[PDB]
Amino acid sequence: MRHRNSGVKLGRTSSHRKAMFENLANSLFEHELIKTTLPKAKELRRVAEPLITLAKNDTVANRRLAFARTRNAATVGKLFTVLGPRYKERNGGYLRVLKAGFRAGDAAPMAYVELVDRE
Amino acid sequence: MIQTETMLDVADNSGARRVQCIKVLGGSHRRYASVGDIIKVTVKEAIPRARVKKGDVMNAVVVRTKFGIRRPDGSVIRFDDNAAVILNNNKAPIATRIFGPVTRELRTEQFMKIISLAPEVL
Amino acid sequence: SGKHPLVQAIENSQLKTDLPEFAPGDTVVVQVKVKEGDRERLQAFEGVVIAKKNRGLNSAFTVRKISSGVGVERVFQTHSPVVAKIEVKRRGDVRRAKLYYLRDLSGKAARIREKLP
Amino acid sequence: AIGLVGRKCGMTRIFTDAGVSVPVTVIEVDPNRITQIKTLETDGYQAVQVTTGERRESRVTNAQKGHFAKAGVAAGRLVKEFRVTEAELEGREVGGTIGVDLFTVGQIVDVTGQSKGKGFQGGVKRWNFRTQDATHGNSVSHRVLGSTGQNQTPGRVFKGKKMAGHLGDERVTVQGLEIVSVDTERSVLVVKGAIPGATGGDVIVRPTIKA
Amino acid sequence: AVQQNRKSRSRRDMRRSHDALTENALTVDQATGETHRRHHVTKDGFYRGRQLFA
RNA sequence: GUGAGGGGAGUGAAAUAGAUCCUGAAACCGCAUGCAUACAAGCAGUGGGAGCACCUUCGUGGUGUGACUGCGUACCUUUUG
RNA sequence: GAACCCACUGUCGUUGAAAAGCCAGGGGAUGACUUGUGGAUAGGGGUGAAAGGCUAAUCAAGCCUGGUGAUAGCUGGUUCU
RNA sequence: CAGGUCGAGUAGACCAAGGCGCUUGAGAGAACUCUGCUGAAGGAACUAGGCAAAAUGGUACCGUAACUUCGGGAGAAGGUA
RNA sequence: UAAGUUCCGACCUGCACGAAUGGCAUAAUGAUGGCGGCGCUGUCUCCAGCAGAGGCUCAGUGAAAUCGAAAUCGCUGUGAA
RNA sequence: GUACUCUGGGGAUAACAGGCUGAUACCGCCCAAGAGUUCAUAUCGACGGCGGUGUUUGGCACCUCGAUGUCGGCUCAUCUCAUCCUGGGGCUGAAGCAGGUCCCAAGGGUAUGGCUGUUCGCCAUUUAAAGAGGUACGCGAGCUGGGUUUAGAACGUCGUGAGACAGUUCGGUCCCUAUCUACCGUGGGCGCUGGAAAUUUGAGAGGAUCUGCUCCUAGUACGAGAGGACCAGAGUGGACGAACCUCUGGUGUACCGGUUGUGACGCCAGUCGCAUCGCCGGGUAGCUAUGUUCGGAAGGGAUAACCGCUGAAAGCAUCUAAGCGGGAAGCCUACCUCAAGAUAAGAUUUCCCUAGGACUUUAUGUCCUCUAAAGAGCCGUUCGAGACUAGGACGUUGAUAGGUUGGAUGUGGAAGCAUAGUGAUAUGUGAAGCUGACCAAUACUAAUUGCUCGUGAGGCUUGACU
Numbered sequence A: 001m002r003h004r005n006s007g008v009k010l011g012r013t014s015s016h017r018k019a020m021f022e023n024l025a026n027s028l029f030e031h032e033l034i035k036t037t038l039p040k041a042k043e044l045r046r047v048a049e050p051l052i053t054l055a056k057n058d059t060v061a062n063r064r065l066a067f068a069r070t071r072n073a074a075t076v077g078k079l080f081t082v083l084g085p086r087y088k089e090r091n092g093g094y095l096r097v098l099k100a101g102f103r104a105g106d107a108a109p110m111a112y113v114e115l116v117d118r119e
Numbered sequence B: 001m002i003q004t005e006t007m008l009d010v011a012d013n014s015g016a017r018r019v020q021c022i023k024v025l026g027g028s029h030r031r032y033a034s035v036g037d038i039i040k041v042t043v044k045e046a047i048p049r050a051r052v053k054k055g056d057v058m059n060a061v062v063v064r065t066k067f068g069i070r071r072p073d074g075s076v077i078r079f080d081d082n083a084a085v086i087l088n089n090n091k092a093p094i095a096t097r098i099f100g101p102v103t104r105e106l107r108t109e110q111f112m113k114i115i116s117l118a119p120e121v122l
Numbered sequence C: 001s002g003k004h005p006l007v008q009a010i011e012n013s014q015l016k017t018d019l020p021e022f023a024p025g026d027t028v029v030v031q032v033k034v035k036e037g038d039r040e041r042l043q044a045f046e047g048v049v050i051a052k053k054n055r056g057l058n059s060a061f062t063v064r065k066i067s068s069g070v071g072v073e074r075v076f077q078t079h080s081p082v083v084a085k086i087e088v089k090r091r092g093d094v095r096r097a098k099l100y101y102l103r104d105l106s107g108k109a110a111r112i113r114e115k116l117p
Numbered sequence D: 001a002i003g004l005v006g007r008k009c010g011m012t013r014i015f016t017d018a019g020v021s022v023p024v025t026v027i028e029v030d031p032n033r034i035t036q037i038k039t040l041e042t043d044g045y046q047a048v049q050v051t052t053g054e055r056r057e058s059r060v061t062n063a064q065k066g067h068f069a070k071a072g073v074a075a076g077r078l079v080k081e082f083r084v085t086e087a088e089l090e091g092r093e094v095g096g097t098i099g100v101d102l103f104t105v106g107q108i109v110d111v112t113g114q115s116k117g118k119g120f121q122g123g124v125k126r127w128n129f130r131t132q133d134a135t136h137g138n139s140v141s142h143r144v145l146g147s148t149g150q151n152q153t154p155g156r157v158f159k160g161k162k163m164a165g166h167l168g169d170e171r172v173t174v175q176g177l178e179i180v181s182v183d184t185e186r187s188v189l190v191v192k193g194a195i196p197g198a199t200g201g202d203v204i205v206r207p208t209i210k211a
Numbered sequence E: 001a002v003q004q005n006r007k008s009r010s011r012r013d014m015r016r017s018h019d020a021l022t023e024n025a026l027t028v029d030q031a032t033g034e035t036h037r038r039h040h041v042t043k044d045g046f047y048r049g050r051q052l053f054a
Numbered sequence F: 001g002u003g004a005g006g007g008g009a010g011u012g013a014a015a016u017a018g019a020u021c022c023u024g025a026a027a028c029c030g031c032a033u034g035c036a037u038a039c040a041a042g043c044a045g046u047g048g049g050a051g052c053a054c055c056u057u058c059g060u061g062g063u064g065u066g067a068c069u070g071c072g073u074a075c076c077u078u079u080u081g
Numbered sequence G: 001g002a003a004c005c006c007a008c009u010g011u012c013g014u015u016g017a018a019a020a021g022c023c024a025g026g027g028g029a030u031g032a033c034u035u036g037u038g039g040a041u042a043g044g045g046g047u048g049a050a051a052g053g054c055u056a057a058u059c060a061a062g063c064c065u066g067g068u069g070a071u072a073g074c075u076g077g078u079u080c081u
Numbered sequence H: 001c002a003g004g005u006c007g008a009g010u011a012g013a014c015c016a017a018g019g020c021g022c023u024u025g026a027g028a029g030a031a032c033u034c035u036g037c038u039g040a041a042g043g044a045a046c047u048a049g050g051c052a053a054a055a056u057g058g059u060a061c062c063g064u065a066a067c068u069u070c071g072g073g074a075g076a077a078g079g080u081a
Numbered sequence I: 001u002a003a004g005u006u007c008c009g010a011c012c013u014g015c016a017c018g019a020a021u022g023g024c025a026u027a028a029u030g031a032u033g034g035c036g037g038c039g040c041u042g043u044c045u046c047c048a049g050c051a052g053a054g055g056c057u058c059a060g061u062g063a064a065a066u067c068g069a070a071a072u073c074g075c076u077g078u079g080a081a
Numbered sequence J: 001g002u003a004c005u006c007u008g009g010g011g012a013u014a015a016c017a018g019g020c021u022g023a024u025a026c027c028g029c030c031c032a033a034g035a036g037u038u039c040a041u042a043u044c045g046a047c048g049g050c051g052g053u054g055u056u057u058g059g060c061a062c063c064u065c066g067a068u069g070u071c072g073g074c075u076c077a078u079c080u081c082a083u084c085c086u087g088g089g090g091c092u093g094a095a096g097c098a099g100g101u102c103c104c105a106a107g108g109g110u111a112u113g114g115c116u117g118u119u120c121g122c123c124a125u126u127u128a129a130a131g132a133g134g135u136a137c138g139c140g141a142g143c144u145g146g147g148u149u150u151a152g153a154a155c156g157u158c159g160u161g162a163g164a165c166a167g168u169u170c171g172g173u174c175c176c177u178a179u180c181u182a183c184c185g186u187g188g189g190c191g192c193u194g195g196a197a198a199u200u201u202g203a204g205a206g207g208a209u210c211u212g213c214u215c216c217u218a219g220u221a222c223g224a225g226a227g228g229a230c231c232a233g234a235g236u237g238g239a240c241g242a243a244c245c246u247c248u249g250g251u252g253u254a255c256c257g258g259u260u261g262u263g264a265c266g267c268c269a270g271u272c273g274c275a276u277c278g279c280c281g282g283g284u285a286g287c288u289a290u291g292u293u294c295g296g297a298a299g300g301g302a303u304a305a306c307c308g309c310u311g312a313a314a315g316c317a318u319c320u321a322a323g324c325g326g327g328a329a330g331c332c333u334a335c336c337u338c339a340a341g342a343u344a345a346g347a348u349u350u351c352c353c354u355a356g357g358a359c360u361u362u363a364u365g366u367c368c369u370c371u372a373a374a375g376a377g378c379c380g381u382u383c384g385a386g387a388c389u390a391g392g393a394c395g396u397u398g399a400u401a402g403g404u405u406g407g408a409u410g411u412g413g414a415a416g417c418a419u420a421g422u423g424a425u426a427u428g429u430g431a432a433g434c435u436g437a438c439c440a441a442u443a444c445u446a447a448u449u450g451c452u453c454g455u456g457a458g459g460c461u462u463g464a465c466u
Ligand SMILES: NCCC[C@H](N)CC(=O)NCCC[C@H](N)CC(=O)NCCC[C@H](N)CC(=O)N[C@@H]1[C@H](O)[C@@H](OC(N)=O)[C@@H](CO)O[C@H]1NC1=N[C@@H]2C(=O)NC[C@@H](O)[C@H]2N1
Pocket: H020, H021
């Protein structure tokens, strides 16, 4: 049973899963539109949106927390310079997940992840 | 929560120091004994020149357990040791002093002497 | 407040309104009501608070003491009417919420430093 | 007997004046609205049909909408019957409501619910089977069934043999619970002990049959 | 463990009687007029009156 | 897909002689049509037998199917069996 | 006590990753030690700190080809009316 | 042949130079199987058998019995930092 | 040991010990046989939770041993029993 | 001689299990010398006689040698009654408490350890009791492999020897992915006299069925005393089962913190990767027992042994032949769950569909045209539901999921900056910072535009009412 439990496994160890979602968040913040599998896309919200929420207040402690979470100076700079001021007045829901058919190699269901006000 | 093969300290001056439980009395297939329950014990260590000797098979009553007991308000009381008190063939205490605290589960006509002799009842 | 509002409302009507502030590492005296037949009396339980659970009506705290060379712990339910009164005798200085490490210490090693204003 | 349909809200405790902690379960009761009365003349047996809760009109079908409109009551989230006697039928009419005041403090009741679902389960959990040795040469048989029959005679497995399968998610009735509180202003029943099912599930409270 | 008798073609087909495939849910998109998988972005990047790739 | 493969055109007496290409059997595997088949227990047939479809020399006829029913435990070998 | 050489216990594997292994432990590890290259001993023979061990995944008498279509009071099979 | 930090070390953990991510993937997170981590109270009651697990584990100093072929036993046991 | 067909010591009517197919002992040594104790523990009372790998579902590739033919139920009886 | 072994054959012929039989084995009955102070039959019962069962030791050689492959343990069972406990009775050399013996009764229940490979047995300590048997001496395509029975080696003994054993001892590979039947779960299809959404009756099926101790009656009845009840009430336990997570705990590798080694982020500071989650201390939900609550209560009907009432055959007697009763943990009900594929397919409430042509096979007839209802499903957001399914909720007329805001909880004094110290560090800002799964609000994001299925008033005969 898994009554009321949250989180995913995705056939990975916990550290590998955490690193993979870190990489996905960095790629999404850089490019503002990515394509991945549907379960990864749905779980990516719970990791990426709190980072944008944190970036709404620009302090040394918040920047250091963001650096601990992402390990990417360019991502920290973009978060605290562009994305946070952009979403200052938006109450959550900074991402958009859209189904995008299936993948040729393994028939895996796919999806697009997009920032809400990309362009 | 005392079962067969459990070692127990002795909380009196009958002469035994360590006993081992060899049977939990009071029913077929009964597993555990708690405070106020009667057990059969074998004497593993004893004071020299005492009345009880090493290798004797006697009855005993459990007075303290590490598993602890429940109270009606939902609390639990736990001790640091498992301790027993030696009884005769008529299931009456045969000691004249009690060491350490006991609990109010012993306030019966069978074990009133332990209550009256114990340094503390909690 | 992790329960449904109706459950919270039912629990709230039973809360005690005069509990003192106390923390793990303190030494306290708890007065317990003892009923024998019709004889009512108060018995003191004095010792060190080694654990405290804050859950509203389901709050509890564990007190440990040494009695005639035997260690004894009791887990008091904070809002039960059986607990008549709680006195804080001394305030301790500790570094963690749960002090189970005191169970393996004796005498001098188990001393708790006093918290000094 | 005539009873109530309620919803399990969660467990808590009540402290008595002497200090005893009584574990209790809370049941919310939206007052049950009578939708139909069945009689010997037209149905062949005597029962009272009730509804409770709410349901949006986009989810209420036309047939059920007409059924509710005939009784003159708002649509509920469920419909349920209670078998009754002639004496119990007195004072009950279509369109009336039944509240928590049907019960009194100290009354003994039976509570019916739908137990939690454990899914596909094995012999150890389902039937309290014993496990075999974890060591001493045991190869791959720790939680397996073991033997399931005898031999050429009878050369088959008997019906009702205990095996692995679905466990839980069944109708369960717990008998002999005591009513601790009847809160009319909040429309709540507080009963002693545990009742089947998960928080938010539908429960039925009836007077005890072990009377 | 293995069969004692070969299974007949009739029984094999009876077992396969549950193997038929089904149809996907396809709908016409209002913005473009093209058939697309329902609730999915079209192959040209349109969904719900929005365009993804310039 | 400048692939494989095929449909036309053309050659040839013949291309269902089109390249591992004369003839093209059986096991085995598809599609189409007709009848039967989802309340009934077994070597699957046999002796009866209603109904349906097509054909017809219109029937006391032909072809296909076969509701219902009596009887009925494969073959070879080795054996007292 | 590493490399190196072994193979005492256990789980796994047993249509294996493997026709003898993996993993966790284990023994020797300056010696009667381990190892490369090239040689010698050939079948009632060789070699053996000796288990009938080894002698090309084969050993109470290796493999190959001949005698040879050995013999079998035994088992099986033996085809149209 | 074989570097760096600790290290007695070619043991070990993480790194350099230099190489790789082992030629099916994506989901789900039932019984049962394999491999691990933790576990109330009890502590060999298991079992053919403490099988398997758990446990001990370093450096310096102190201290160390019977027996003895006078070499050992011995890192006996045990203790302090 | 609470309880000991094993173990240790002793007894001598040795079914059927006995002195280089050596007798009786023996410090050290042994992955050697038997018995006991401390510590330790999921070995067990009695199992619970969690992590990884399968199992399950989807897409691709695609085995095996077996096999007279099958429209392949229970019971009691019968009968190469 | 071969246990270092090999080939051709046999169920023509042995060892295992099955079969026939029942000498033997076990159980029962008949007669009755006698024993029992007298008194065969309370309890025993010689010499003899008659049966039953199919557990033992055997007899036979019918099945299997082109294989039916195991002594004990483990796991899981199912049946019998010749009944171990609990229930109901008759007799007694039955005062009471106990006991002996026989009859009825199979609902439930019916030990843990020491020794040994043991089944068995002896022993220790319990229990209401630790029953006797059948099921391939149940169960090894479910586990083990200690004993027996391969190949190594040794002792006693036998033999000249190779070797061998009414013997002993140390060591010594347990294969198979389940087609069919059976069983445990879970779906798809069609049927059920037009279709649909709900609520239901119960033919029947399964589950459950145990019991100790104390008090009271009452130190009463009984008994010279010692002892000590029936019947009838109260309380409190053992084992077993279910549900649950408020309490007590376990776990809790996406929560918090301490800390070692190493590498990196330019450096300090602050952090991150790896080392079993590196190690260590705590811990939210969920799951869970050792934790919590509940259950086997009470009552009807027919009976078993047994006890009768009235009553003749048979002027008496007699429970029986006519007629009328009592009587058990056993049977039928009663309690819980399932149940109309109950093809005999049941009942109730409500909802939906009422259009035109042609023709001949004049029929619930075949082609056209027009219609597409009530509902169901596909799809999506999902769940305390789940292998896939099925089931529950919701899809903008929206709180279904994520996010956001607040709260709660856990861990515990973030970073930065100031002070005090040579410094390790300590204190303040401040119970701060961070906080998976929880509670409550909130359309910010995603549940879009949609499609498919399901029709058009439901044959005939008879009867009763219109
Ligand atoms: N012209 C056309 C010619 C056609 C050609 N013949 C086809 C051919 O031969 N195919 C061979 C397929 C083998 C492999 N699957 C290829 C692949 O898919 N590599 C994925 C990498 C792609 C990525 N975008 C580039 C990247 O990250 N590079 C790094 C980088 O350079 C460097 O790391 C740092 N830190 O700087 C280096 C350390 O030395 O490691 C490389 N990473 C590496 N990963 C590789 C690995 O595991 N093995 C082989 C070798 O490729 C390895 N190096």
